[PDB]
Each structure stands twice: as C-alpha cells, then as structure tokens.
Ligand SMILES: *[C@@H]1O[C@H](CO)[C@@H](O)[C@H](O)[C@H]1NC(C)=O
C-alpha cells in the first residue's frame with residue numbers, strides 16, 4: 001500500500017518534517033495553527049504513540065517545492081492527516097514554516113552489545129562489539145575496510161546519539177578500556193535504515209579483515225544535527241540550453257577536464273563542443289551547516305573559476321539512455337562551497353574569494369550558474385533521441401546529511417539534434433511510486 005505521509009530530516013525514527021502525498025507529489029505542511037492534536041494524528045497514522053511535540057518553523061529541516069496543507073485542524077479522530085480540515089491557500093507560507101513532529105516511540109532501552117570506546121567525547125569513539133571468545137565475554141572491533149557514513153549513521157542511531165558526523169576506517173589514536181585487540185566483525189555494509197549495526201550485511205564470525213591500518217577498527221563521530229543538500233529542480237528546468245562553443249574559448253575548460261574525451265582531437269582553431277548548459281542551485285535544507293570534509297590543505301585551485309574547490313567530486317552530471325546506462329560520458333564536477341543567497345532574513349556566511357572558509361549555511365543555497373565554466377554535460381558525441389538527465393549531489397556519501405534520498409535529480413530530455421526540451425524535472429522520491437514509473441515510460 002502507498003503511504004500518504006512521511007517524515008524526513010531528523011535523527012530518530014518517529015521524528016521529522018511532515019510531508020504529505022497530494023496529486024502524486026510529496027509536499028510539506030505550513031506551520032500556521034500547527035497543533036499537537038493534528039501532530040499526534042500523523043504520529044498515530046505512522047503507528048507511534050502520539051506527538052510529544054508539534055514542531056514549527058522547520059526546526060527539523062526544510063523542504064523544497066509544494067506546500068500542500070496549511071492550518072491543519074484535526075479533531076483527533078481522523079485515520080490520516082489527509083482527512084483533517086485544512087486551509088488550502090499557502091501563499092503567505094514558505095519553507096521556513098514547514099511543520100514537523102516528534103512522536104512518542106519506544107526506546108529499545110539499553111545497549112550492551114555495542115559501545116563507543118576511547119575518546120574524550122561521548123559522541124565519538126572506536127566502535128566495539130561484545131562477543132563470546134573461548135568462554136569469556138570480550139569486546140572486539142569492526143573491520144574498517146569500506147567503513148562509511150552510512151554504517152556510521154546506523155551506529156549513531158543504535159546508540160541514540162543522533163546522526164553520524166564522520167566515519168573513520170583506521171583508528172589508532174583511541175585508548176579506552178581493555179579490549180582484545182582483535183577484529184570481530186568485518187565487511188559491514190549498511191543500507192542506512194537498519195536499527196543496529198548487526199542487521200546490516202556483514203560476513204558472520206568469518207571475519208576477513210585486511211592486514212594494515214584498517215585492523216585497528218572503525219570509529220564514528222555522532223551529532224544531533226546534520227546538513228541536508230537538495231538540488232533546485234525547477235531551476236535546472238528554467239536554465240537549460242545548448243551552446244556549441246568554439247574550442248578556442250574552452251582552453252581552460254579542456255585542461256580542467258570539463259570536456260568529454262573526443263575533445264582531445266577537436267580542432268582548437270575551428271572546432272565545436274556542444275554543451276548542454278544549466279544552473280545547479282544546491283540548497284542546505286538540513287539542521288546544520290554543510291562543510292567540506294577536509295581543511296584548506298586539500299582544496300584545489302580551479303583555474304577556470306579562479307577560486308578554491310573544497311569538494312573535488314560534489315556532483316555527478318549525466319545524460320542517460322532510458323534504461324539507465326550513460327549515453328553521454330558525463331562529468332564529476334568540483335565545487336566552491338559558499339552561501340550565495342539565503343532564505344528570508346538569514347545571513348550569508350561562507351565565501352570562497354580569499355581562501356575563505358567554505359560551506360553552505362542552513363537556509364542558504366550555493367548557485368553555480370549556467371554561464372560559469374563546467375556547468376554542462378558535453379554532448380558533442382550524442383545523437384538525437386529521448387534521454388534522462390540526472391544530477392547527483394554528494395554522490396559518494398562523503399559528507400554526512402540527514403537525508404540522501406533527495407540528492408538525485410532527473411529530467412526527461414528530448415534532444416532534436418538542434419535544441420533540447422527538459423521536462424518533468426524533479427527530485428527523486430518526491431513522486432509516488434506509481435508516478436515515478438510513468439516518468440520512464
Ligand atoms: C539500452 O542500454 C543497452 C545497454 O545494455 C544498450 O545496448 C541499448 O542500446 C540501450 N537502448 C537504447 C535504444 O538506447
């Protein structure tokens with residue numbers, strides 16, 4: 001069956017921004033006359049107790065797109081928040097008033113088979129797991145090989161410390177209490193939704209770990225907040241065009257690797273690249289600032305843009321066959337991360353200009369306009385046809401977010417050979433499943 005309401009953002013199951021399925025599109029509810037009784041109608045609909053809290057003002061993060069409901073006024077007797085009386089004009093409403101709930105839910109009371117060990121912070125440590133070894137109950141560690149944010153998220157969730165902020169593959173700097181210095185779990189990969197590290201895929205007590213620095217064990221760092229990046233779909237829709245650019249203006253772009261491979265043999269003096277340009281306006285809609293993983297030492301000067309780029313692979317840009325295999329070669333752009341404009345009265349902070357600190361503030365967005373170099377897919381080699389355009393933000397889960405189900409954007413693309421039409425542009429998971437089907441057929 002298809003649910004008509006869901007929670008996004010927010011760390012604990014049963015907590016988050018209320019979003020509702022209306023006209024095949026998910027969309028938020030404005031917080032005017034948001035009340036506890038209505039809130040607890042969504043808590044009951046999702047099968048938890050009832051609202052501790054009727055959260056207002058997007059405190060658990062913002063949405064983008066349609067604000068569907070407004071001034072909800074449930075009686076308390078409705079089987080679903082889509083039955084309560086509501087005011088359908090949200091015009092005075094924006095996405096700093098997206099409502100949210102904190103439902104009463106059971107806490108699985110205490111954790112005894114998993115712990116964080118070492119470190120001065122309750123919120124971080126090497127992750128250790130209780131096992132049985134030769135009769136004794138001992139604490140061992142987890143293989144660090146391919147230990148990422150997603151697994152880290154499952155640990156922090158299981159331990160009740162909110163989100164993951166970091167994951168570590170090799171930890172040698174953490175002391176703690178006596179262990180066994182022996183890897184005890186390994187090969188762990190989590191989907192993200194698991195309720196305990198052990199419920200992810202892992203090999204069992206046959207714990208193949210490599211021999212190296214990854215044998216010390218994975219650690220996490222957890223936080224009660226996290227950023228949430230979203231691409232602005234309406235805008236790649238409004239800003240898309242073709243340009244065939246003489247090669248003599250793409251000298252910079254060539255060396256910074258912004259062209260597909262055929263460009264090597266394209267005539268500098270006389271040649272084209274056909275460039276599908278567009279604007280990437282990435283919002284930070286989560287609960288804290290988005291920040292690059294590394295400090296200044298790792299940032300790399302972008303010759304074309306003439307500023308430092310703190311994230312070497314911020315996006316995947318691709319044009320795809322309808323089956324899903326790339327028809328273009330696509331690109332892995334790198335990004336200066338700054339606040340170009342903010343919502344409402346929020347104050348711009350991060351700036352790239354003078355080796356400035358980089359990041360995207362809560363409530364702001366970072367816009368890489370269509371005319372800037374590398375905002376394209378090179379399409380010189382691509383024949384006319386019926387394709388899917390896709391943009392993935394933060395594609396390798398390199399920096400922690402409160403939601404990765406929204407980091408993908410797809411448009412249907414009809415290419416004449418002479419012009420292109422981008423339509424049905426949207427954030428994956430913003431449509432109903434049936435409707436998400438009709439967009440590929
Ligand atoms: C679909 O992808 C497959 C790759 O297995 C490719 O062979 C085929 O040409 C694609 N279909 C079309 C018509 O683009």
Ligand SMILES: [Ca+2]
Pocket residue numbers: 228229230401402403404405406407
């Ligand atoms: Ca996101």
Ligand SMILES: [Zn+2]
Pocket residue numbers: 302305307309334335336
């Ligand atoms: Zn840049």
